[PDB]
Amino acid sequence: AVIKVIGVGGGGGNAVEHMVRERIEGVEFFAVNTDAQALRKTAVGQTIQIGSGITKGLGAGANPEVGRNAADEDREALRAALDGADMVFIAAGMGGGTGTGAAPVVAEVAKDLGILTVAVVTKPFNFEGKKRMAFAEQGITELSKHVDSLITIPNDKLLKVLGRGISLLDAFGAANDVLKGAVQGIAELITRPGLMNVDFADVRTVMSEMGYAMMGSGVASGEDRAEEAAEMAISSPLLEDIDLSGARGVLVNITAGFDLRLDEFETVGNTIRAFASDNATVVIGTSLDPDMNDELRVTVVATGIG
Ligand SMILES: Nc1nc2c(ncn2[C@@H]2O[C@H](COP(=O)(O)OP(=O)(O)O)[C@@H](O)[C@H]2O)c(=O)[nH]1
């Protein structure tokens, strides 16, 4: 499996840098930006400059029009980077000029190539202002036209569960971890399975041409960890208002060490199928993280929600 993760713009590039640091098994990372300096800074091993860096006016690059035109002009470079992938993840912070405008073009290029294309993006914090929130939603409207699944993370919802005198860096770190959670949860079912390997056709079925999606995750240790982690995932703040019996698809990743047991696989699957519909596709897989000993994580991606 060839899986590529593309960070688009400053925010997405920061999120993908977090994914590089904290590791996602068996994926290739890319950063796509108008900002040549940013691409020079980044730890991402593959970079793609779009638009070659021409602005017209101080702050003119905050307009999504600029990101869209830049990616439009460099569609051939994007296609050469994406081609050969079985799956593409697009990460972006929506609301700025580059991510908002260029992420839907990156998605369109991937989708036109026949690649299963999953976007995981954020909306700005409320304190960033109404102009950025409006740009973000307009970009998400365009992005939804060109992806198989779209997971939109409201940064403002993350901010409320963080409180305190958190730094802005940690505020964006919280969004980064959610984005990583979603990408890693989907991709590692393919790139490093555990005792139960998912068929890629099933991943395609739950994610393909599905529209809106949402991710929740949970972790637990000890004897009841499998049921505990599944329940925490189901009840996480991101999934709590999703009726899981209204999701057209559910993809579940159980991640644990070598000591994952078959009966734990069965428990998690039975729990998830108790909340989902039989008129839905439910896919349960495992990933192996040899560094985990006692802990078990369940990540749930609900797709085709409305
Ligand atoms: N996760 C993350 N999000 C960011 C960061 N900086 C900005 N954002 C969010 O992403 C949105 C777009 O900002 P930015 O990506 O820098 O603009 P762009 O490069 O033109 O797309 C902002 O409005 C913020 O909500 C960051 O370092 N990490």
Q: Which long-range contacts (CB under 8 A, 24 or more apart) does 133-138 make?
A: 133/95, 135/64, 135/94, 135/95, 135/96, 135/100, 136/94, 136/95, 136/100, 137/94, 138/64, 138/100
Experimental method reported for this structure: X-ray
* Rg, C-alpha atoms of the chain: 19
Please identify, among 191, 223, 241, the residue that sits at the C-terminal boundary of a domain. 191
Q: Cβ(100)–Cβ(64) under 8 Å?
A: yes
Tell me the C-alpha distance between 114 and 118, whole Å.
12
Nearest residue CA, atom 17 of ligand 1?
Answer: 96
Instruction: Tell me whether residue 285 is annotated as binding.
Output: no
Q: What order do you get walking across the sheet with 87-93 strand by strand?
A: 46-49, 27-33, 3-8, 87-93, 116-123, 149-154, 211-220, 296-303, 249-256, 281-288
Instruction: Tell me whether residue 63 is annotated as binding.
Output: no
Residue carrying structure tokens 């700005």? 124
Q: What is the CATH number of the domain that holds 71?
A: 3.40.50.1440
* Cα distances (Å, whole numbers) of residue 244 to 74, 146, 184, 302: 40, 25, 21, 7
Give the distance (Å) from ligand 1 centre to CA of residue 9.
7
Tell me the C-alpha distance between 107 and 90, whole Å.
7
The three-point CA angle 123-129-130 to 5° equals 80
Chain centroid to CA 61: 25
Please count the structural domains in the chain. 2
Structural domain including 79 reads 3-191
Is there a single domain that holds both residue 103 and residue 221? no
Sign of the C-alpha dihedral, residues 181, 182, 184, 185?
positive
Instruction: Tell me whether residue 51 is annotated as binding.
Output: no
**Which value, to the nearest 10 degrees, does the dihedral of the CA atoms of residues 154, 160, 161, 163 take?**
140
Which token pair is 116?
């299963």
Nearest residue CA, atom 16 of ligand 1?
Answer: 10
Tell me the C-alpha distance between 97 and 65, whole Å.
7
Q: How would DSSP label each residue in 248-272?
A: SEEEEEEEE-TT--HHHHHHHHHHH
